[PDB]
Amino acid sequence: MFRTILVANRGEIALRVMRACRELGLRCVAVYSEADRDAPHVAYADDAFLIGPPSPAESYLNIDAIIRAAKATGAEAIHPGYGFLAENASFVRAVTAAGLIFIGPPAEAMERMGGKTAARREATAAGVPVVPGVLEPVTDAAEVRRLGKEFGYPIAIKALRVVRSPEEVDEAFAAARREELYVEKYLDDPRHIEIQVLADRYGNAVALGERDCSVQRRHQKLIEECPSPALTPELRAEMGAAAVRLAKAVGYVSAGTLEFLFQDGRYYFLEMNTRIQVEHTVTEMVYGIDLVAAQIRIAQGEKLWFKQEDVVPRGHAIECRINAEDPLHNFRPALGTIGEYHEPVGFGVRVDSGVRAYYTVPSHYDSLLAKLITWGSDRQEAIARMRRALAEYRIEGVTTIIPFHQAALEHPVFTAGAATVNFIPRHPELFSRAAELTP
Amino acid sequence: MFRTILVANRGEIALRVMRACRELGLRCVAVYSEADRDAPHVAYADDAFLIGPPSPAESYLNIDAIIRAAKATGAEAIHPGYGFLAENASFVRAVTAAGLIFIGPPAEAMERMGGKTAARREATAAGVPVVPGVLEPVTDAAEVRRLGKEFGYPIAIKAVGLRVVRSPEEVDEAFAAARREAEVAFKNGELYVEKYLDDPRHIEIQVLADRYGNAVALGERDCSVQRRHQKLIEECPSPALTPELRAEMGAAAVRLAKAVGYVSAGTLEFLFQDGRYYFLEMNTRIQVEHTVTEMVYGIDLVAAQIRIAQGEKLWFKQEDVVPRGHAIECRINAEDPLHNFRPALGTIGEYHEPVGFGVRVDSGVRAYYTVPSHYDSLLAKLITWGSDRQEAIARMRRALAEYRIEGVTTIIPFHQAALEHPVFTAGAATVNFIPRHPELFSRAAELTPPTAA
Amino acid sequence: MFRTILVANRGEIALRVMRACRELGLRCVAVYSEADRDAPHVAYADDAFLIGPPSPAESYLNIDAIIRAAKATGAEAIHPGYGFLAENASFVRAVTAAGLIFIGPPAEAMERMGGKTAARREATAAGVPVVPGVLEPVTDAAEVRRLGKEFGYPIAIKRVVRSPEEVDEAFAAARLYVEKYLDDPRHIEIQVLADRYGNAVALGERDCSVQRRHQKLIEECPSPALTPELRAEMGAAAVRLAKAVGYVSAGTLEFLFQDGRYYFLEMNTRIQVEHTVTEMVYGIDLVAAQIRIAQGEKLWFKQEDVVPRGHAIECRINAEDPLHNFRPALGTIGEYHEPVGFGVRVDSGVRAYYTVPSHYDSLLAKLITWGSDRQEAIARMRRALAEYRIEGVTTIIPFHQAALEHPVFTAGAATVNFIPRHPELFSRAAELTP
Amino acid sequence: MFRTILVANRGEIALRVMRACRELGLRCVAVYSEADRDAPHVAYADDAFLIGPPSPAESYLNIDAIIRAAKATGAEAIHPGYGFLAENASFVRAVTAAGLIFIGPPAEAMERMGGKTAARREATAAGVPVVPGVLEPVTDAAEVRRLGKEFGYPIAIKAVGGRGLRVVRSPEEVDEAFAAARREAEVAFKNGELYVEKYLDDPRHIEIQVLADRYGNAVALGERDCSVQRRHQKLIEECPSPALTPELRAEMGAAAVRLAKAVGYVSAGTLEFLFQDGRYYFLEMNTRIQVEHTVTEMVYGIDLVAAQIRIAQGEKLWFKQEDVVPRGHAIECRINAEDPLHNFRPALGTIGEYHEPVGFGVRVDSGVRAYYTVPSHYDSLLAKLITWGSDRQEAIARMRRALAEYRIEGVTTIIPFHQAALEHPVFTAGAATVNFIPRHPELFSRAAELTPPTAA
Amino acid sequence: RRFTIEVNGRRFGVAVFG
Amino acid sequence: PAPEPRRFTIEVNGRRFGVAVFG
Amino acid sequence: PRRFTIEVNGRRFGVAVFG
Amino acid sequence: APEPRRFTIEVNGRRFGVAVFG
């Protein structure tokens, strides 16, 4: 049993984890770069330490600095949060050698699921479907055709080109050589479905549902919801069971997320995030579980206090990321000073934030100012609450993508539950409405 | 089907209803006295109207004034909230004659359950237990003795309790003292007898009904921790109830609700001691503590009232009513816990409300706001939800500590002390929690910080 | 045939006659008292003469002064107008003796119709009904009852007696004369135009019953109470009476109409203040007709050519306070804006920034509207009343607006007792007054 | 049944329509450009709206602006008045599509009678005589002669120039005229194409008023003589015309009603004819109220603007042709604020002192007031002076008095011209033709004699 | 104190009683 | 505190209104 | 920029006059 | 012809445009 834990992060997650520490009767220690000296998470924590200059490399990604902070403040365990050193096995090994407990997966499990190729092997060994593909370079155009019959068109050549017919493979191979290749199956309109897993040191694992993080811009998420409207009760069980299987095979011991691609009733594994998830909030509100508190207990050696039969979804939750970007100008980073800050309030409204009023947003690190989460009895309620909260969230001085969120939540495709990975590309009318909602 | 509704209330509740209106896509209109011109609910609403001077009788209790405001603002329905005119049948009838919809029970049901005596009689029908009593003037000490055996000692003598009688011999002295006291103070001198419960618990059942006779029970609430007879902390579920007792009480509540012709939300309050529950009275309105039931059963009661007012049949059945987790609410009243909960006045300087998962704040104040004195003490309500009771208590403790309300004294220290008390931690809080544990105030003082305006 | 005409009057009527003079190519000479030096009719006229001080007795009623003005100004005939030496045979005799033409009836005819008793005698001859009455004093109560049988109850002692029993007590209370009493009569008058050569025509009726204390306020043509049958009979009676008396020029025979029966009261010997409604409905210039008859033209039309078209109503804009018993109001008018439009006529004697002489009448102007049907005339009059701007002095225009909204007036049941029986008029009048 | 009406016009006519609204208990809404902000019509109205910039195309001819104004003010019907969009079918269709009632004829009737060519075709179909002419191009001089035989000399050669490029009275003159007309059109008009029409030496302009209801009932409300005109713009109008006989009045009225019913007409309209030597010829139909409706309005005792509104609400005609009876005579003189003696060149300025004539049988329909700056961007008509009499002589005398006693100080008006004409022996006799002004220049000498000096 | 005011086109005659 | 308002009576096209302006 | 609160016959209206 | 005073007034989020004369 450890009494004080050090949070090796900043912003939203740092404050979120500290709240969990306070509730569990634990002491939280903050770490900050010179840019984050006057930051919200530093004031909230019981203790603070200056780990280095603003560059992420010399602060927040500095293993030696974080270990030093834990020693100076007396911390006995470290919660990585998400990002930086959260998925770095080396940091885990340094943390264990110093005598401190890592509030996360073990080092060896982190490594086995680190690389996309390594993860694919571990998922096939555990009977989780993967995207049909060849790991080695493709020698000639004929192999593309034969691989095309085996997988089923459309297929895609990567180092890029999408080929819909066997005839088109002749030209596409020519173009790909111009720009040494490999082939994988291509999904026209997939959905990003991910499964949350919680495990303990003693091999007990549970699947805490799905999340549809499909509204994405350039592979960067913007809206997340739980449950996913596209999954059926049978698919949910199969994917959850598969997730627990892969987790047990790698020896997982903390909270984790398995990301899949879902198209035409079939799901394919892509990557595993061996950390807490940014959008764990939607899962937390629907299944009524404190995941960060759960991480701390399982790290303390507690055996899982519940079973899969106890995991029950109630309601629907949506999360909009308040990123500081220009929705009207290709989401270009927006920086500046926040003047007036007023968070929306009400039943079923949650704001996990890393900013305050009269705060100059560090230009380094992330664009995430805060995360707005709403819960409702049904999805329609959750959408209605999110629309009110977005309107009544006041962030002055800095540009936010809140207009985009408001337009998306009004879009018929989102209302109907047809949000795909191509939601933003296929409907550019969102930005016209977003333009209408800006000052 | 109406599009704009007027909220005939102030402070916390008025904002609570307005948020529901906004979520349902409806326009909300606010009414305010001269004191609440700078109040949060006036700024929040889509429209507002000045109904009168700070006096409650000339403002929020003015039936004709409220109706006139609704016409000027175009309101088609009125939400009474939880105080002024919410349980006044006259206000309902004025609203009906003006052509507007009352977002609450019908007038006739409201009347039948209005008086404590009337509610008790309606409860004797429909087979709901009531406090064993006479309620009719007792003539002499001998009748008290016979009624004492029938009800079972202890019993209590009351007037139109004054004294509690534990033995048959004790009845003559108490009857004499109780009569003189009534005559001198209440100019009545006529008494009645009721059974006395030494260490009861205040347990209430929430019921929702539709215009079409479908009624459902949305669980229990423990409102045991009270000063005087005013609730300070409420939690759901109650640790004293068993699953079977919970169902039995819910069934009684729906039976009583249906017999009276109830529509909308309401709350039936019981007294619980030694495994037995007794009906006292029914509140024909939304309850201030509806928040905890909302967190455990995942239902928006204010939205539910609006739907039932628009004529929808209940969209769920008793099988759908399922509790998840535990919710506790500590009422942030502006009073000095260390000096007989004396009213506290002033202007709120710096206001920062707690945040997090499972933390809810329904407030009627803001930073740099002068709190009106003419009304209540409730500045806001701090509500937390957890996976289990321990989680809810921890979040309530963190939120209580991290609630910053500067310039005015609140009972926030008292609350923290209570949530440390071993009796509370077990769930043995009875109505006489504060009276029997005066060590709470010691702890309160230690957590009371030095303050300045 | 004369070329210069003198108008021995002031104000509204004086301007009206002059307009007729100009249209006929004739010269207008005005007469004015010291009060009316800055008056509209003196400015309008081709010539003017100062007849005396403001007192009516010493100015507009001075026969010698008017004859003096005619000589000095070169006038060859004089038009009396209404209300000043009009119906004065003495003025006619002076005017005829002075070598001038009197634009009106001849003196002998004017005299025969002057007094109410004298006119009644001339009216019983020629078969015109009169109010059943006794001209001599009533000796005892028995005669009243006997007079009650002859006339038919109700009767009036000069108190109203409804039965023979009430006559016994009522006769005691008054201590006379007795005449039949009409409970709710209507004031109906008939227009007559006559020729020097014995030609006479009846130009219709007028209902001037909206009246306070025997003073007319609203006048309309035709009367809603008259039927075509009554109209012919009454007009014929009017022409019959005129021919017996030797009438010349314009005249008005006033009757009382009750329960389908009409009774003669008086004959006004000159032009009528409310002649305007008749002019608008029958399309005749009566003042021009008077001038032509004066130079000797024979009537240019016959009764068959007299045809009514439309309905006309006239409101008198009187300088009086309706809210306070029509009390003369005086002062100076600041801004004057007259209502205008199709079917709106304003005969006025005031202007903007004019101080109203107090020594005379209260008539500031007369507002007349015409419509296709009575309803148009009511709507047109209501608009004109609203858009009449008289800012310095109080007028009875609010009373007019209330009356024209009243249900009884809308239906055409206004009687001589209209104002007494409906005091709600003054409540409505107060609302439109500020 | 509608309660608020929007008047899409300015000046005299707008006030005239609004007064009709007030009497009928209806609300009138005014539209105004920036120039007419301080205009009388704006103030009279119950409500008002800026239609746009002083440019007519951007204001009173801007269809969307008028409809938008009606929506903001709550108007349910639109009265076009005379001019602007009153005969514009596009405006009618736009108003119908917006849910508003057009107080006028339906779009289809308006279109069928819009162009001069279409109307004459519709008039021959309904058995209304038209000016004998061939609208297709005439190739050679021989066709002119043949067309001259059929039409009857004189005839007039014109080019596709409304008035004859040349008038030929004999067959012999056609060779010279045809040559002369071709160059003139080629060089200037730019099209050698000509056509031939019958020529009337001394015609009279006689027009017939037609009123119809939505249910096919149509009535003829008499004639008007609008002969005294400068250029082709009317200056004096009278009712009845002295040249018509009682029989011709009915014959023409019947023809007018035939055409109106045949085209499906609704509301008020005016059919214009040319009258010479006992013969009448149709020219064009105005699908609107006529500026000179006042004279008919006073002679037949009908409020045509009120009548337009009633039939617009769907009332069936409340009278029959037997009820249409003329009484008396009416004349209208246009106070056009232009300089006589200077070829009626527009006169502008600010009106200082304004005193309108008053009396029995005098009506003044005005769009100006005292101390008013007269906008230059539109019309020249300040007001219309109308008089009624028992006979024509009376009406003329009243017009003579009213003209003298009309006081307009800041601006020049043609009031002297009116006074000279009303004294002219030809006008007194009722012989005024379309060539009245050209043939008698003594009018302008007398006008100078009666013209007060205006200075600056 | 009388002025004329044009709210988005609509003419209104106002009169402020200070 | 509580600065008193400025109260005016405004007649718009003949309609009397009671206006209170704050600040 | 210039923000006031106005109560027209009771109804609260939030005004902003700008310029 | 005095020129008007033109403001943009936002009342409860509704932008009206006003023009005052005199």
Numbering used by the authors:
A (entry chain D): 1 to 159, 168 to 187, 196 to 455
B (entry chain B): 1 to 160, 167 to 459
C (entry chain C): 1 to 158, 169 to 185, 197 to 455
D (entry chain A): 1 to 160, 164 to 459
E (entry chain H): 470 to 487
F (entry chain E): 465 to 487
G (entry chain G): 469 to 487
H (entry chain F): 466 to 487
Article passage:
Acetyl-CoA carboxylases (ACCs) convert acetyl-CoA to malonyl-CoA, a key step in fatty acid biosynthesis and autotrophic carbon fixation pathways. Three functionally distinct components, biotin carboxylase (BC), biotin carboxyl carrier protein (BCCP), and carboxyltransferase (CT), are either separated or partially fused in different combinations, forming heteromeric ACCs. To investigate the structural basis of BC1 as a bi-functional enzyme, we determined the crystal structures of BC1 and BC2 at 3.2 Å and 3.0 Å resolutions, respectively.
Crystal structures of BC1 and BC2 at 3.2 Å and 3.0 Å resolutions, respectively, have revealed a BC1 tetramer consisting of two BC1-BC homodimers connected by an eight-stranded β-barrel of the BCCP domain. Although we identified a complete BCCP domain (Ala459-Lys596) in C. aurantiacus BC1, the crystal structure only resolved an N-terminal β-hairpin (Pro466-Gly487) that composed of two antiparallel β-strands. In particular, four β-hairpins cross-interlocked to form an eight-stranded β-barrel, which connected two BC1-BC homodimers at the N-terminal sub-domains to constitute a tetramer. The BC/β-barrel interface was mediated by a symmetrically distributed hydrogen bonding network, which was composed of amino acid residues Glu475, Gly478, Arg479, and Arg480 from the β-hairpin, Tyr32, Arg37, Asp47, Leu50 and Ala72 from the N-terminal sub-domain. Each β-hairpin was stabilized by hydrogen bonding interactions between Phe486-Thr473, Glu475-Ala484, and Asn477-Gly482 amino acid pairs. However, the tetramer formation of BC1 was not affected upon deletion of the BCCP core (BC1ΔBCCPCore, Met1-Lys510). These results indicated that the β-hairpin but not the BCCP core mediated the formation of BC1 tetramer. In the modeled BC1-BC active site, bicarbonate was immobilized through hydrogen bonds with the carboxyl oxygen of Glu295 (2.8 Å), which is conserved with Glu296 in E. coli BC that plays a role in stabilizing the bicarbonate during catalysis.
